Design a protein around this ligand. Structure first.
Ligand SMILES: COc1cc(Cl)c(C#N)cc1C(=O)NCCN1CCC(C(=O)c2ccc(F)cc2)CC1
Ligand code: NA
Length: 201
Protein backbone atom coordinates (compact mmCIF):
# COMPACT_ATOMS: atom_id res chain seq x y z
CA UNK A 1 0.00 0.00 0.00
CA UNK A 2 0.97 3.62 -0.51
CA UNK A 3 1.93 5.77 2.44
CA UNK A 4 1.77 9.54 2.44
CA UNK A 5 4.37 11.31 4.59
CA UNK A 6 3.11 14.77 5.53
CA UNK A 7 5.84 17.36 5.22
CA UNK A 8 5.73 20.34 7.56
CA UNK A 9 5.91 23.87 6.05
CA UNK A 10 9.03 24.51 8.17
CA UNK A 11 10.74 21.64 6.39
CA UNK A 12 13.61 22.49 4.02
CA UNK A 13 12.28 19.79 1.68
CA UNK A 14 8.78 21.23 1.70
CA UNK A 15 10.21 24.66 1.09
CA UNK A 16 12.48 23.37 -1.62
CA UNK A 17 9.57 21.73 -3.45
CA UNK A 18 7.30 24.74 -3.10
CA UNK A 19 10.10 27.00 -4.30
CA UNK A 20 10.54 24.85 -7.44
CA UNK A 21 6.82 24.90 -8.12
CA UNK A 22 6.35 28.67 -7.63
CA UNK A 23 9.46 29.64 -9.58
CA UNK A 24 8.63 27.64 -12.68
CA UNK A 25 5.30 29.24 -13.43
CA UNK A 26 5.43 30.68 -16.94
CA UNK A 27 3.20 32.38 -19.47
CA UNK A 28 1.78 29.82 -21.82
CA UNK A 29 0.95 30.37 -25.45
CA UNK A 30 -2.68 29.54 -24.79
CA UNK A 31 -2.99 32.66 -22.64
CA UNK A 32 -4.02 30.56 -19.64
CA UNK A 33 -6.80 28.74 -21.47
CA UNK A 34 -5.92 25.24 -20.23
CA UNK A 35 -4.51 25.88 -16.75
CA UNK A 36 -6.08 29.12 -15.67
CA UNK A 37 -4.72 32.60 -14.98
CA UNK A 38 -2.34 33.03 -12.09
CA UNK A 39 1.13 34.11 -10.98
CA UNK A 40 1.40 32.02 -7.88
CA UNK A 41 0.03 28.91 -6.22
CA UNK A 42 -1.43 28.51 -2.78
CA UNK A 43 0.22 25.25 -1.63
CA UNK A 44 -2.24 23.47 0.69
CA UNK A 45 0.10 20.60 1.50
CA UNK A 46 3.06 18.64 0.22
CA UNK A 47 3.38 14.93 0.88
CA UNK A 48 6.00 12.33 0.20
CA UNK A 49 4.78 9.16 -1.49
CA UNK A 50 6.15 5.92 -0.04
CA UNK A 51 5.27 2.74 -1.88
CA UNK A 52 7.55 -0.24 -1.69
CA UNK A 53 6.50 -1.91 -4.97
CA UNK A 54 6.93 1.38 -6.85
CA UNK A 55 10.30 1.99 -5.26
CA UNK A 56 11.41 -1.54 -6.10
CA UNK A 57 10.31 -1.24 -9.72
CA UNK A 58 11.94 2.15 -9.99
CA UNK A 59 15.26 0.91 -8.54
CA UNK A 60 15.26 -2.18 -10.75
CA UNK A 61 14.71 -0.01 -13.79
CA UNK A 62 17.31 2.70 -13.13
CA UNK A 63 19.76 -0.16 -12.74
CA UNK A 64 19.11 -1.31 -16.31
CA UNK A 65 19.18 2.28 -17.49
CA UNK A 66 22.51 3.27 -15.94
CA UNK A 67 23.87 -0.05 -17.27
CA UNK A 68 23.09 1.37 -20.75
CA UNK A 69 23.93 4.97 -20.04
CA UNK A 70 27.54 4.60 -18.99
CA UNK A 71 26.55 3.95 -15.40
CA UNK A 72 24.46 7.07 -15.10
CA UNK A 73 20.78 7.25 -14.19
CA UNK A 74 20.58 10.82 -15.45
CA UNK A 75 17.76 11.41 -13.00
CA UNK A 76 15.81 14.67 -12.84
CA UNK A 77 12.98 15.99 -10.72
CA UNK A 78 10.13 17.00 -13.00
CA UNK A 79 6.49 17.88 -12.65
CA UNK A 80 3.57 15.84 -13.88
CA UNK A 81 -0.07 16.74 -13.63
CA UNK A 82 -3.09 14.78 -14.93
CA UNK A 83 -6.47 13.50 -13.67
CA UNK A 84 -4.92 10.17 -12.62
CA UNK A 85 -2.65 11.37 -9.81
CA UNK A 86 -4.47 9.14 -7.34
CA UNK A 87 -4.04 6.00 -9.42
CA UNK A 88 -0.43 7.00 -10.00
CA UNK A 89 0.55 7.22 -6.33
CA UNK A 90 -0.92 3.72 -5.75
CA UNK A 91 -0.13 1.84 -8.95
CA UNK A 92 2.59 3.99 -10.45
CA UNK A 93 2.85 5.56 -13.89
CA UNK A 94 1.43 3.39 -16.67
CA UNK A 95 2.34 3.95 -20.30
CA UNK A 96 -0.50 1.67 -21.39
CA UNK A 97 -2.75 4.66 -20.70
CA UNK A 98 -0.83 6.67 -23.29
CA UNK A 99 0.65 12.67 -27.75
CA UNK A 100 3.04 15.16 -29.32
CA UNK A 101 5.95 12.75 -28.97
CA UNK A 102 4.11 9.49 -28.87
CA UNK A 103 2.52 7.11 -26.45
CA UNK A 104 4.76 8.09 -23.57
CA UNK A 105 4.32 9.53 -20.07
CA UNK A 106 4.99 13.29 -19.99
CA UNK A 107 6.79 15.57 -17.51
CA UNK A 108 7.46 19.29 -17.46
CA UNK A 109 10.23 21.38 -15.93
CA UNK A 110 7.60 24.12 -15.52
CA UNK A 111 4.98 23.44 -12.89
CA UNK A 112 2.59 25.70 -14.84
CA UNK A 113 2.89 23.33 -17.81
CA UNK A 114 1.79 20.37 -15.64
CA UNK A 115 -1.04 22.45 -14.21
CA UNK A 116 -2.39 22.73 -17.74
CA UNK A 117 -2.95 18.96 -17.64
CA UNK A 118 -4.33 18.50 -14.16
CA UNK A 119 -7.92 18.46 -15.48
CA UNK A 120 -7.15 16.70 -18.73
CA UNK A 121 -5.67 17.50 -22.12
CA UNK A 122 -6.04 21.21 -22.71
CA UNK A 123 -7.39 21.36 -19.18
CA UNK A 124 -10.45 19.35 -20.19
CA UNK A 125 -13.68 20.92 -18.96
CA UNK A 126 -11.89 22.23 -15.89
CA UNK A 127 -12.64 21.36 -12.28
CA UNK A 128 -15.52 18.91 -11.61
CA UNK A 129 -17.60 21.25 -9.48
CA UNK A 130 -17.47 24.41 -11.61
CA UNK A 131 -16.33 23.25 -15.06
CA UNK A 132 -13.80 26.02 -14.69
CA UNK A 133 -10.27 25.61 -15.99
CA UNK A 134 -9.21 28.68 -14.03
CA UNK A 135 -11.09 27.72 -10.85
CA UNK A 136 -9.57 29.32 -7.77
CA UNK A 137 -11.66 27.30 -5.34
CA UNK A 138 -11.16 23.62 -6.11
CA UNK A 139 -8.00 21.90 -4.87
CA UNK A 140 -5.66 20.60 -7.59
CA UNK A 141 -3.01 17.92 -7.32
CA UNK A 142 0.33 17.72 -9.06
CA UNK A 143 3.37 15.45 -8.77
CA UNK A 144 7.02 16.44 -8.52
CA UNK A 145 8.78 13.27 -9.60
CA UNK A 146 12.11 11.52 -9.93
CA UNK A 147 12.38 10.73 -13.61
CA UNK A 148 15.04 8.36 -14.89
CA UNK A 149 15.95 9.91 -18.20
CA UNK A 150 19.06 7.85 -18.93
CA UNK A 151 20.33 8.64 -22.43
CA UNK A 152 17.90 11.19 -23.89
CA UNK A 153 17.02 11.34 -27.54
CA UNK A 154 16.43 14.92 -28.77
CA UNK A 155 13.37 15.29 -30.99
CA UNK A 156 12.76 18.62 -32.75
CA UNK A 157 9.49 17.82 -34.48
CA UNK A 158 6.25 16.20 -33.49
CA UNK A 159 6.50 12.43 -33.93
CA UNK A 160 4.34 9.52 -32.84
CA UNK A 161 6.87 7.35 -31.03
CA UNK A 162 6.00 4.12 -29.29
CA UNK A 163 9.29 3.84 -27.39
CA UNK A 164 12.53 5.75 -27.00
CA UNK A 165 14.88 5.31 -29.99
CA UNK A 166 17.28 2.36 -29.91
CA UNK A 167 19.90 2.82 -27.23
CA UNK A 168 17.82 5.57 -25.58
CA UNK A 169 15.59 5.74 -22.52
CA UNK A 170 13.84 9.05 -22.90
CA UNK A 171 12.84 11.69 -25.38
CA UNK A 172 13.33 15.39 -24.82
CA UNK A 173 10.97 16.94 -27.35
CA UNK A 174 10.63 20.41 -28.79
CA UNK A 175 10.09 24.57 -24.79
CA UNK A 176 10.99 20.98 -23.98
CA UNK A 177 8.76 18.11 -22.95
CA UNK A 178 10.34 15.19 -21.13
CA UNK A 179 8.89 11.90 -22.22
CA UNK A 180 9.62 8.39 -21.05
CA UNK A 181 8.04 5.25 -22.44
CA UNK A 182 8.12 3.03 -19.36
CA UNK A 183 6.20 3.79 -16.18
CA UNK A 184 9.08 2.43 -14.05
CA UNK A 185 11.36 5.28 -15.06
CA UNK A 186 9.39 7.70 -12.88
CA UNK A 187 8.61 7.64 -9.18
CA UNK A 188 5.87 10.08 -7.94
CA UNK A 189 8.03 11.47 -5.10
CA UNK A 190 5.93 14.44 -4.02
CA UNK A 191 2.17 14.82 -4.08
CA UNK A 192 1.44 18.56 -4.07
CA UNK A 193 -2.07 19.72 -3.21
CA UNK A 194 -2.76 23.31 -4.17
CA UNK A 195 -4.97 25.99 -5.70
CA UNK A 196 -3.95 28.49 -8.35
CA UNK A 197 -4.29 32.07 -7.03
CA UNK A 198 -6.25 34.82 -8.70
CA UNK A 199 -3.82 37.65 -9.50
CA UNK A 200 -4.47 40.89 -7.62
CA UNK A 201 -6.25 43.80 -9.29
C1 LIG B 1 0.56 14.55 -23.61
O1 LIG B 1 -0.09 14.69 -22.34
C2 LIG B 1 0.52 15.27 -21.22
C3 LIG B 1 1.59 16.27 -21.29
C4 LIG B 1 2.17 16.82 -20.11
CL1 LIG B 1 3.44 18.00 -20.29
C5 LIG B 1 1.71 16.40 -18.79
C6 LIG B 1 2.31 16.97 -17.58
N1 LIG B 1 2.82 17.46 -16.67
C7 LIG B 1 0.67 15.43 -18.70
C8 LIG B 1 0.04 14.85 -19.92
C9 LIG B 1 -1.06 13.84 -19.76
O2 LIG B 1 -1.60 13.68 -18.66
N2 LIG B 1 -1.46 13.14 -20.81
C10 LIG B 1 -2.52 12.13 -20.80
C11 LIG B 1 -1.97 10.67 -20.89
N3 LIG B 1 -1.34 10.13 -19.66
C12 LIG B 1 -0.99 8.72 -19.93
C13 LIG B 1 -0.34 7.99 -18.73
C14 LIG B 1 -1.30 8.04 -17.54
C15 LIG B 1 -0.73 7.25 -16.31
O3 LIG B 1 0.47 7.25 -16.04
C16 LIG B 1 -1.73 6.39 -15.53
C17 LIG B 1 -1.29 5.47 -14.47
C18 LIG B 1 -2.28 4.69 -13.80
C19 LIG B 1 -3.69 4.78 -14.14
F1 LIG B 1 -4.64 4.04 -13.51
C20 LIG B 1 -4.10 5.67 -15.16
C21 LIG B 1 -3.14 6.47 -15.85
C22 LIG B 1 -1.58 9.54 -17.18
C23 LIG B 1 -2.22 10.19 -18.47
NA1 NA C 1 1.28 11.58 -19.35
Amino acid sequence: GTILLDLAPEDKEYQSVEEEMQSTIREHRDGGNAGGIFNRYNVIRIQKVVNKKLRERFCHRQKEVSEENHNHHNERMLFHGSPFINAIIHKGFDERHAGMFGAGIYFAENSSKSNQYVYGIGGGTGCPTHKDRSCYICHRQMLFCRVTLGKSFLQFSTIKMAHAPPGHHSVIGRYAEYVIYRGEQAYPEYLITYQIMKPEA
